[PDB]
Amino acid sequence: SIAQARKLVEQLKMEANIDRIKVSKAAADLMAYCEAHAKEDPLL
Amino acid sequence: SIAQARKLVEQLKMEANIDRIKVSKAAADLMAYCEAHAKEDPLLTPVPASENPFR
Amino acid sequence: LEPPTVVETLRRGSKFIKWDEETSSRNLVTLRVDPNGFFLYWTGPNMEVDTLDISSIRDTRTGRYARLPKDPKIREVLGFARLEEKLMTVVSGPDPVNTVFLNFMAVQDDTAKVWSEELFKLAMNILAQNASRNTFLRKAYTKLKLQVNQDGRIPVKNILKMFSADKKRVETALESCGLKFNRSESIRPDEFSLEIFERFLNKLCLRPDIDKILLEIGAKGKPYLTLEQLMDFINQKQRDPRLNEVLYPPLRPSQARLLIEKYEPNQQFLERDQMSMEGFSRYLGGEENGILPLEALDLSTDMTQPLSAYFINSSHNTYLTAGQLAGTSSVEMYRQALLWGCRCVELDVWKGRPPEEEPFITHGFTMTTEVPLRDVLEAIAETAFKTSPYPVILSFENHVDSAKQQAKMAEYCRSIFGDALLIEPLDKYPLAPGVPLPSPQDLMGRILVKNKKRDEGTASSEVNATEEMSTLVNYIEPVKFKSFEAARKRNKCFEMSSFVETKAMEQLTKSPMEFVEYNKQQLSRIYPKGTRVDSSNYMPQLFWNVGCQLVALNFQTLDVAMQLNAGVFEYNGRSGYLLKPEFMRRPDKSFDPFTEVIVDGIVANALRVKVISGQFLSDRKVGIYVEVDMFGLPVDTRRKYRTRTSQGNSFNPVWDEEPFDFPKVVLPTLASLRIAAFEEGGKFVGHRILPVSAIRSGYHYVCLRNEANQPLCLPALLIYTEASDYIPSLMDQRARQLAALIG
Amino acid sequence: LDQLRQEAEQLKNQIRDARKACADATLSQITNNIDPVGRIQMRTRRTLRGHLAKIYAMHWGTDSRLLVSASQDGKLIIWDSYTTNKVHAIPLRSSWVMTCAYAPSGNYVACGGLDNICSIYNLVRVSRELAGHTGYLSCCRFLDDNQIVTSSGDTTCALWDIETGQQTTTFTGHTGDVMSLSLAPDTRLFVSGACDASAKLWDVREGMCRQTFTGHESDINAICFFPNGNAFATGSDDATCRLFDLRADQELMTYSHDNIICGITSVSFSKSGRLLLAGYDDFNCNVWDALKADRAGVLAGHDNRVSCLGVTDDGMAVATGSWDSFLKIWN
Amino acid sequence: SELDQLRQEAEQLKNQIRDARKACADATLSQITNNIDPVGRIQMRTRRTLRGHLAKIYAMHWGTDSRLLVSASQDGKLIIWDSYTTNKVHAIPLRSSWVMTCAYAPSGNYVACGGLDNICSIYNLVRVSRELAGHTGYLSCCRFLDDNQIVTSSGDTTCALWDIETGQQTTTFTGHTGDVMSLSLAPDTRLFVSGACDASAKLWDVREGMCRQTFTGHESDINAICFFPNGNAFATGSDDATCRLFDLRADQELMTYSHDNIICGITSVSFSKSGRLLLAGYDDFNCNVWDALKADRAGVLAGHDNRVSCLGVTDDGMAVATGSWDSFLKIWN
Ligand SMILES: [Ca+2]
């Protein structure tokens, strides 16, 4: 039963070594996506 | 009661010591019969209308 | 109570010569009964399998009771010494007046006593009359599988006839499930299986009435309930909350695991304790989710109380089959009455002829057709105890004047009835002033005689009895009604006094409390006036609400009054005896019946019937509207409720509107619901009359009957009841109340 | 009674492994090296009007000219298939007939029915009145001038002697109704089909049930005997014909098909034994092959249920009796 | 002493996960898109009503050329519709009656199926061309990569990528606990996410068969998912009646589309062409189109009577088809 939990330890240890992308550039890129295609949208 | 079950075994008793022949010969006895009689059977091949009594 | 079981000598078959006196044509067919216990099918005269709905069988009389052939062409063919033990006639039909005969004749010895005993056991079985909804769809699938054509396949002209609201769906719904969908083609009976017919009915109709339930119980996105979401669906929404929960235990998570393993089709849901959407559309018309429980349908009432404290099903001039003036009297009408559940019949014995002196039956001074008396008592003693072993009260209108006809009709009853005619008083209850009447238990299997001891129509010109006819009158006895204070002071509880409908409305409203105070000791029958010459009926609820016992109707014309007196006597095991509620049979605590307020001593209920929808309601594309009556005490009677008519869109309409409330019913063990569904245009479809203290709450299928309480196969409703306890110029004072009840 | 159950059934599994030891090659394997008969079509040559109700049974003569029929009117009629002249007209005294027969001499024609009594007519009036069945009679066939084998509904058969009228031997051993029987062309043995799905093979010499055959799952309605004497073909209510042998002790073919559901009523063989003419319940008579298990033509000619057949000893034609009072002779 | 000493570290780094979000907690879209004007009042109309089904529609999928749409129903009848001329081009029956999904191909000559019978049956454009068995739960949603490989999502808490020439579970994915109700692909098909039943949104990398990112946030079921068209964000449905918008770069939920008088939960989510709109379905039979960067209702698409079961714009964003439970698959514009 511990081997189910020992999969989770190797599941969460790879969540530590992920590059942090902050929301300043990221959410503004989602802002920039809706503006770069703002006239190619037949439901507005 | 018991006697109908007694004779049920005794009728089945003579069914044990019966003899047989193989189905390869049993399907050869039938297959000899049809082809030796297919020349005159009036239902495989029809007959002339003169000898035919129903026409 | 047993489920309908087919014995081995009915599944395999026997060989029966079916004859008919009309066309004088007899074949040689082999009768069978399909293993569910539904139909009586035989391969026909031109190789087309006929049927007969086995719930539409009223009696199967054999032997000396059967119908003998009268034509010497048929008589010389069948062979007419002791061979009138192989006959069998199976009467059928919806009403008592309309009966068809199926004159069989067996070809082996002693196979007709076995059959006709085991067909009457299958026609009068409770759990195949109050059955499930899913049982009433296997009764409409077996009808489709039996009636094959000559080739032996199911014709598509039968599937386009049974579900025939719009045939543009059935031609589409057959073509999408993988069968032959043309107008003249055939489906083979082993590629038309119950798994396929179930898949046929899902494609046929669209069901938002079920899907509205599946949003309130929490099934949101996953196609399965849990065990927990079902275990508190029953104990929260579909549990009758009048009842004591210590004796009626709520549902356990080990008990609800069987409800999954009985209905759920998929295997990946069965092992995980989860029920799919098709498992819940199967459960709602299962054998546990019924509109009534099986404690109020079998013979479970306190049968120890005396005979003054019971509703006794009764009749008035029950020998007639038409209007009261120019009709035709019969003798078959007694057999259809005493089999239905009647327990008091009427006989108008009139003086016979001067050629030979023997009495007979006819209506006085109307030149109606006459039936002889000797063949009436043989049609009474035969069938008095074939459905209910509880006593029958004969009620003579003795009109003869000769002395020799009086003794001759006295010798008939002591000969035809045998030992079942109560000629002596019992040991425990002798006829002295101050005693009570016997119970139905201690009179079980006996037959009493009502006659004089030693706008009325014809019952006012009655003759003084003689010393021979007066020997049979023992317990129930007529005496001319003088007053109330003379009756209570005398205190002989073996007297009765008949009242017409008029003179008992002059004594229902003038003094109702003394009427109930008298109706706990003694009897009083009620029979309608002579000005209803078309044989219509007054409401019996006018005179049960003061506790009369033998309220008598006309059994021939089935209007809403006679559709009541055979829907309120279907309970207590169809025995024709119902116990009066507690404060109408107790000598200490009396009450006014006309009370606009609740009474201290009776708990009051409240009801909210919501009529959601209903499937397969009609043969033609037309709208349906539902009336929800509720009879009772005059402060309970509401007859104004009705839905709006639907559009006739498909097989099932949907009504989406407010529920019908009944807030304060003072006496709820006397009240009774009624849910009639009409066609748009007054044409009847069905009705079901339920009692009030026994009806469950929650989402149920009410499976409609016809106008004489025989089950219909396809139509039903999906209603939602909600019962709970209640948490709070004298004539015109009372005549303005009964006008909701008289109509 | 405990010991009797197992030692009887232990021999009943001694049959199956002895049957499995014999079943080396079923008959469909050997006949593949022979071409089929292809298509064969018969037409209605004569038609026999004069009956008034449903027709139940028929049996050609050994002189191969006449026949007989037994209607529900109780009107036994002897036809002539050459000129369509009713040669006699014999009225019964019990209109519930169920079978008839014909003698090899041509002089005696028997007919019995639901009235349990096998009357025998002379060629006119009854000569012998054979009674003793406590159930309904279902089929009877003549052996010779003096002996007739009947098949009642009291789960028996019989072997009479009509000069005395007494039963010589009661061929008992069935557990349900006995539906039909068929003698042998050498007239030494016969078969019997029941409502227990139990064909058999008896013998007229000793009186014993010699062999026993099972295999169907419904009633058995009619059985014919092969013109070799080696085989016999049965017909059941499960819309199948089968073909056994007295030596192989097992079914050898199974003449079934899809879109054939309703039961069977009467079978027979041809003169050689090549065909197997069955008469079904969906009003058509089929022609199978005794070796190929393929159809070869349908006799779609009747308007009600076809209830009896019979093929002449000269093999000229067949005849089908139906429920609409018609006898169609097909050649 | 061993089963406790892992739980001290099984929740140690998880607390570093949320504390990494606090270091990344810089702004939301309410404080960075507040100077953006809305789109106004959005009205649509029933352009074409595709009658032709017999029972509840349970899924649909658009084609590649924005013309053909498939629609599997509960009666077991795939119909490949033509939106331009209101045509039933094919009508493929099924051997699996209880359906809950359907698909189409990017090249456009293959269809899929699925449902309660645990089998995904690829057809050809009509005969049964393939079969995919091996799931021990109900099939719920299946999508296509190309003509050779197909992903599914099942009721046995496992997603599975298949091969269409062999018919076996080539790559199998594990890690959820409840059922797996829907999945969707990124527009590059390099990484696909799926939403479970027990309130999680996990991302599976297709090239390796092992997760790399796990989202949380819901308190109930998840019944739909769909991608933002640039492939760096996605959005889900729920049972708690709130859609979301997650950031695959920033690992954090960004915006909730919550509103009062909204008690029915979502059953279908799909974005629009330029990513300004988020459409949705509900149990009030409407189809509330939400503006993305303002978290606000902007239009009601109310043309049904029973609940909405599937929804989706085209590959150019011209039309939008909602398939309800009344067999009436509309097209809005
Ligand atoms: Ca009268």
Numbering used by the authors:
A (entry chain D): 8 to 51
B (entry chain G): 8 to 62
C (entry chain A): 13 to 92, 97 to 470, 576 to 849, 867 to 881
D (entry chain B): 4 to 126, 133 to 340
E (entry chain C): 2 to 126, 133 to 340
The paper states:
We reconstituted Gβγ into liposomes consisting of 2DOPE:1POPC:1POPS at a protein to lipid ratio of 1:15 (wt:wt) and incubated the liposomes with purified PLCβ3 prior to grid preparation. We determined the structure of the PLCβ3· Gβγ complex to 3.5 Å and observed two Gβγs bound to the catalytic core of PLCβ3. One Gβγ is bound to the PH domain and the first EF hand, referred to as Gβγ 1, and the other is bound to the remaining EF hands, referred to as Gβγ 2. Both interfaces are extensive, with the Gβγ 1 interface burying ~800 Å2 and involving 34 residues, (16 from PLCβ3 and 18 from Gβγ ) and the Gβγ 2 interface burying ~1,100 Å2 and involving 44 residues (21 from PLCβ3 and 23 from Gβγ ). The Gβγ 1 interface is mostly composed of hydrophobic interactions, with three hydrogen bonds, whereas the Gβγ 2 interface is mostly composed of electrostatic interactions, including 10 hydrogen bonds spanning the length of the interface. The distal CTD is not resolved in our reconstructions, suggesting that it might adopt many different orientations on the plane of the membrane relative to the catalytic core, in agreement with previous studies showing that heterogeneity in the distal CTD increases upon Gβγ binding. Only small rearrangements occur at the Gβγ binding sites. Both autoinhibitory elements, the Hα2' and the X–Y linker, are engaged with the catalytic core consistent with previous proposals that Gβγ does not play a role in relieving this autoinhibition. Unmasked refinement of our final subset of particles from the liposome structure yielded a 3.8 Å reconstruction showing the PLCβ3 · Gβγ assembly and density from the membrane. The two Gβγs and the region of PLCβ3 between them are closely associated with the membrane and the remainder of the catalytic core, including the active site, tilts away from the membrane. 3D classification revealed four reconstructions capturing different degrees of tilting of the catalytic core ranging from ~26° to ~36°.
